[PDB]
Structure formats: C-alpha cells, structure tokens
C-alpha cells in the first residue's frame, strides 16, 4: 500500500528496503554483529550476499590451483605449510600466482615429485613408516655419509593395499585468510578458550566455535593446528523473519515521544516525515490492536463450500480459481519443511522462501 504501513512504522526504506530483503536475501543486521565492514555494525542497515559472505567465512577465500605437477606445485609448498604468507605473496611459476590476502595458508593435494612434511594420507601407501620406523631410512643414500619421503616414488591420492582406491588429480593451493594456532594453552578466567598443548581439546570442531573476538574454528588433526577464523554471530536475516523480529522489539511509546520531539523542533523536512510516521504509531497505540500482527505465519483458509468442487457435465469439474493458489502455497510450504530437515544449502532454502513468499502474495 503506497504508504507501506510496515515501512512507515519500521523506519526502513519505505518502499525499497523491504522489496530488497522481503522477496530476496538482502539481509538486515538484526541484533549485534561485532566485526566491521570498515565501520561498526549496521544495527539496522542492509548488506549484500557478497559482503555478507565476505564476513562469516573470514576476509578471503582464494583457491589458486597450480597447473602441471611440478612447476607451481613447488613454489607454494615451500611457503604454504605454516609459512604465514603475507599480502601479495608472489608465488613464482605459472604466470604469477597472486596470494593478495592476509595470514596463513593450507595447500591441498600433491602429485609425485617429492613428499615431505605432509599428512598421513600416503603414510599407509609406503608401508615402511606406517608399518615400522623406517621413514628415517626412507632418505635413500645420504643417511650414511614430521615427514620426509623418498626422492619420488608415489603419484596420486590413493590407498595402496593394491593400486585400487585411487584419485589422480590436481594440487589446489587455496589461501585461507585465517589465523592458525598450533600450541594454544589454558587460562581459566573465562571458560577454557581454544585448546591445550596436545591432550585436552575443548574447542568445538571444524565448524562454528566462538572463542574471543574471532568466531569460527576449523580442526586439523595432522599437526595440532586449531584453525580459528575471525567473524562472529552477525545476526543476519532476510524475509518476513527479520521483519517479524523488528516489529516485536518496538516500544511504540518511545517512538511516539521521539517523534513528538522530532516533529515540533527540527526544520520542515525530517519533522514532516515524522508527522506522517506518527499517525500510524498513534493509531496502533490508540484503541487499535497491537502491530506485531501485520506479520503472517498462520494463513486462514477460506470456507470449503465457498470454494466449491462441483460436477458439471460428464467428467467436467469446476472449482474456484482460489483452490489452485492454495495448493501453490500448501506444496511450497511442505517442500520447505522437507527441505529444512533433509539438510539445507542456503541457496535452495531462500530460493524456496522466495517462491513461498510470492505464493502467499
């Protein structure tokens, strides 16, 4: 309705803000959201998926994967494991792999040039070390005059019972803008933050764990490398959900008095807006009902006989067009529920909530 009764009340872009979050996913930082964009949290401002995504998972997600098998697979490896690669880290082989972002790095897979300091993946492949303590002897002929395999015998990501369970592919060099700890200790002020030397590990696993200002914790049982990304519980929501929240947390009286001041004192502009914004807050607050109801989570269903299903001629049935719309809603909503339970990749949830929204319209 031209004066969006909800946009008027909730001082949000009267006509554009809503449209943006309501039907799509242009989140509005509902409560807190510590971490910055360059400025403090947007208490009631909106952001885009890109900037949003660039908040939760850390400042950068780069996955420059090298070509060939030796070239770039050697420049990075020598400076990826533990070696805190600074901004603009110039890897040196194909072209110039540009690690233009923060803290530490984690390389993915290796081919078959030289194996050293890696994980226990190939450990089983070449018995000697997994079988006995021969990894030291692994060093061919120089040993007579943690990992350090032979000069070069293996090739791809496999299980060596027999060369059956294999996987011959690339070598990703994904830079993860996150701070890596390996030997965190215990200080009992607050609840044990992080981890211990090697034994005790109180941290939640590789997913969502809140320590200090940094808020995500991945785990690598290789070295005691407790990966701690930094963003926090930035309450980000879109669609009627977000708005429902906002409308409930509102002491109309306050905004009634606030506007009272805003109305009479400042110049025409903002005070004019305030008057048109006071009318509704007044109506509601008056004999009127309480405004948390503009939200719909429970759709009444119009009577049956009023939306007949009748027999016409032979096999021809005739019904109110309303019934089709109802199924539209019913199905989506059902698909929704299934979709949340069965697991839920963001894209698909929203994409449906969108449809669901349109359906309700």
């Amino acid at each position: 309705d031209v004066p969006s009764k909800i946009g008027t009340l909730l001082d949000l872009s009267a006509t554009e803000l809503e449209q943006v979050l309501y039907f799509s996913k242009y989140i509005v930082l509902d409560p807190k959201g510590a971490i910055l964009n360059g400025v403090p949290v947007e208490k009631r401002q909106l952001l885009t998926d890109e900037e949003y995504r660039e908040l939760r998972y850390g400042k950068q997600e780069t996955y420059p994967l090298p070509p060939g098998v030796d070239a770039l697979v050697k420049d990075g490896e020598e400076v990826v494991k533990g070696q805190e690669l600074a901004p603009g880290v110039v890897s040196r082989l194909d072209g110039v792999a540009l690690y233009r972002f923060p803290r530490r790095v984690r390389v993915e897979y290796v081919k078959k040039e030289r194996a050293g300091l890696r994980l226990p993946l190939a450990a089983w492949v070449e018995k000697e070390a997994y079988k006995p303590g021969e990894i030291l002897a692994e060093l061919p002929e120089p040993y007579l005059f943690g990992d350090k395999i032979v000069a070069a015998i293996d090739p791809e990501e496999e299980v060596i019972a027999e060369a059956e369970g294999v996987v011959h592919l690339h070598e990703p060099a994904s830079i993860l803008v996150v701070k890596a700890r390996v030997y965190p200790f215990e200080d009992d002020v607050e609840v044990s933050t992080g981890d211990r030397v090697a034994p005790g590990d109180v941290l939640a696993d590789g997913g969502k764990v809140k320590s200090d200002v940094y808020g995500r914790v991945e785990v690598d049982l290789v070295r005691n490398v407790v990966r701690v990304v930094e963003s926090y519980d930035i309450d980000a929501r879109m669609g009627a959900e977000a708005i429902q929240q906002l409308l409930k947390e509102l002491d109309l009286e306050a905004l009634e008095k606030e506007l009272l001041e805003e109305m009479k004192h400042p110049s025409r502009a903002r005070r004019a807006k305030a008057r048109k914004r006071l009318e509704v807050v007044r109506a509601f607050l008056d004999s009127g009902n309480r405004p948390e109801w503009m939200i719909l989570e429970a759709v009444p269903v119009l009577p049956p006989d009023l939306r007949p299903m009748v027999q016409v001629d032979g096999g021809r049935f005739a019904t109110s067009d309303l019934n089709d719309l109802y199924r539209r809603l019913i199905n989506r909503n059902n698909r929704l529920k299934k979709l949340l339970a069965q697991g839920a990749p963001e894209i698909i949830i929203r994409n449906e909530k969108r449809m669901l929204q349109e359906a309700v319209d």
Binding site: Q19, F23, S24, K25, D49, L65, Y109, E157, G165, V167, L169, H170, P172, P199, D201, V202, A204, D205, G206, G207, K208, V219, L221, D233, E241, P308, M309, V310, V312, G314, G315, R316, F317, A318, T319, S320, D321, N323, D324, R327, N331, R332, R335, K337, K338, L339, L340, A341, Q342, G343, A344, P345, I347, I348, R350, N351, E352, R354, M355, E358
Partner: protein
C-alpha cells in the same frame, strides 16, 4: 524484482565462484560424507545415542544456532541446554572417538559444498521438464530435492562420478512430483501413463482415418482389456476442472456460479413438507404399541435399515405378529382418515 533471474544468478553465482573439480573436489567431499556417516554410527555405538540424534546435533553446531532448531521443527529439543549437553559428551570422548566427532562435523560440511556446486545440474535437467504443469521454480526445487537424495546413496568407492548419478535421482524426484501435484485432483501414476498411452494412441489414430477415432478404435489399438466404456471413462477424468467463476453467455458480469442450483438445502416447499410429515407422523407414532412399532421405526429410520436381531428379547414370531398386525391396523385406519395417502413423496 521478477524472481527467476535473481535465483538463477544466485546459485549460478556461487557455482561460478565454486564449481566442483571433475574428480578431486567431488571425490573429496564424498569421502568426507561417508566417513561422517561411519562416524555418527560409531558415535551412536559409543554413546548409545540415536544416529538421528547424533546427526541433528552435529548439524546444529555446523549449519545453525538455536534459531534453526526452534522456528523450523518446534522446540522438542531445548534450544540451548539440550544440544549443548550433547556436544559435551562429544568432548568427553577421548582422543579416539573424539576424532569421529571432528569427522562427522567436517563431513556434514563437505556434504553441503557438494550440494551447492551441483545446482546448475538440476537447472539444466529441470529445464526440459518445463511444460508439464509445474512452475519452473517448482520443477528445479523438486529436482533439487532429488539431488540431495542422490547425496544419500552415492558410493564413491564405486568410481563412476556423481554427474550421471544425480541425473537419475533428480529426474525421478521430478517425474514423481509432476504426476503428484500437477493436477487439481490426485490421480495414481498408473492412470497417468495410461492417459498418455491413450493420448499417444489417439495421435496415431488421428493419422489416417481423418475421423477422430471412435471409442472402438482406441479400445482396439491400445491393447488387451480396452473397451468403449473404459475409454469414455478415462477421457472424462483427463479433462481438467473448469473455473466455477468464468465469463458466461454474452461475456458480461454474468458469472458461471449463479447458474448452478442447490440440492442439499430444502427449498421452502420441502421445509413445509418436513413440518407436516413430522407433525402428522408424530401424531400417529403416539397412537401405537411401542414394542414392535418403535423397533422397526428405530431400526429403519434411526440407525440402519434383521428381523431376529430387531426385537430385544422377544423372538421373530411376536415380531412378525405385531409388525404385520399393527402396521396393517396402522395403514388401514389411516386409510380411513386419509392423511398419508397423498404420497408426500
């Protein structure tokens, strides 16, 4: 701003930023998915906790906070304390089983990533099941639902990549839906293919006679037990329901609805009827020997339609006795003072 585009852009965007590497990336996540399962199981084993419970708690800590448990499936599980306590015993698991915990989580996460990267796959498929009767958005969504199903049974031990695998699972979910929701009236799948068959048959039958084939042709052409009565019945179900609200006659304000009459409602005359019938019948019910008059009056007009089982304790001979002597004494003094004669029906 007109849906379609936005969501297309939406995942084509995340796909465009993260497609899955033909092998490496696909195999990777996969291996992490299965071990998650193996983990949750072994967890369930060591904790005596339900795998469904192990699966939901790990999901929480990875996918969302109390927000996702509370609003979706109602608060059966304590938004905080419950899931927390659960996560606790997970920590208590020593260096051995703890390992699985960390595995379950990471696997679950791996799962998601696999799903995201293969959304375009759905779109391409679903893009061909367009004109079936479902919204393209609905078609992809269901197809998507199928993709996830595919993520439940894929065995990476069996070399063949996910691509071909999801194809089937999706298409299955798609067709299912198509036959399930695309109608104002649910009809079993069997009857669906049947109609197709008939339809297809009519086409070939529309190929030479130059006559829209009589229900004889169709019965013949289709096969075994096909008959005129059959075909006529099928096509009558095929036809989609028309709008109770439709332009009528000389296309004006006239709406189809006002044209359909009523039958339940007793139009005034029937109301009048019920009055006299009830009043008069009640006047005759009071002038009668209760026993076998009320038995049949109640057995016939009060419950359902059993001579022996009609009278309480007195057997059939006393039933037939008063039933046929009272009903006749009843019918004839009513023959005298003619009140019911004029068939109220």
């Amino acid at each position: 701003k007109i849906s379609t585009s936005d969501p297309v852009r939406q995942y084509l965007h995340e796909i465009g930023q993260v497609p899955l590497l033909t092998l490496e990336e696909e195999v990777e996540l996969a291996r992490k998915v299965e071990e998650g399962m193996e983990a949750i199981k072994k967890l369930s084993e060591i904790t005596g906790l339900d795998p469904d419970l192990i699966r939901e708690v790990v999901r929480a800590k990875i996918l969302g906070s109390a927000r996702v448990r509370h609003i979706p499936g109602l608060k059966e599980t304590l938004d905080p304390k419950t899931v927390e306590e659960i996560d606790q015993k997970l920590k208590s698991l020593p260096k051995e089983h703890k390992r699985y915990l960390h595995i379950a989580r990471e696997g679950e996460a791996a799962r998601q990533h696999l799903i995201e990267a293969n959304l375009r796959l759905v779109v391409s498929i679903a893009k061909k099941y367009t004109g079936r009767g479902l919204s393209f958005l609905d078609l992809i969504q269901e197809g998507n639902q199928g993709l996830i199903r595919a993520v439940e049974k894929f065995e990476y031990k069996r070399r063949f990549k996910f691509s071909t695998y999801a194809t089937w699972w999706i298409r299955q979910a798609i067709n299912r839906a198509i036959a399930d929701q695309a109608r104002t009236i649910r009809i079993p799948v069997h009857m669906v293919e049947t109609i197709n068959k008939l339809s297809r048959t009519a086409r070939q039958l529309q190929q030479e006679l130059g006559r829209e084939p009589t229900y004889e042709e169709i019965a013949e052409a289709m096969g075994p037990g096909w008959d005129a009565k059959r075909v006529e019945e099928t096509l009558k179900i095929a036809q989609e329901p028309v709008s109770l609200e439709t332009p009528i006659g000389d296309e004006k304000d006239s709406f189809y609805g006002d044209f359909i009459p009523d039958e339940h409602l007793p139009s005034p005359v029937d109301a009048a009827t019920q009055s006299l019938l009830s009043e008069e019948l009640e006047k005759a019910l009071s002038k009668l020997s209760e026993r076998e008059a009320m038995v049949l009056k109640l057995r016939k007009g009060l419950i359902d339609g059993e001579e022996v089982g009609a009278f309480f304790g007195v057997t059939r001979e006393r039933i037939r006795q008063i039933e046929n002597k009272a009903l006749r004494k009843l019918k004839y003094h009513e023959s005298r003072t003619r009140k019911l004669r004029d068939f109220l029906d």
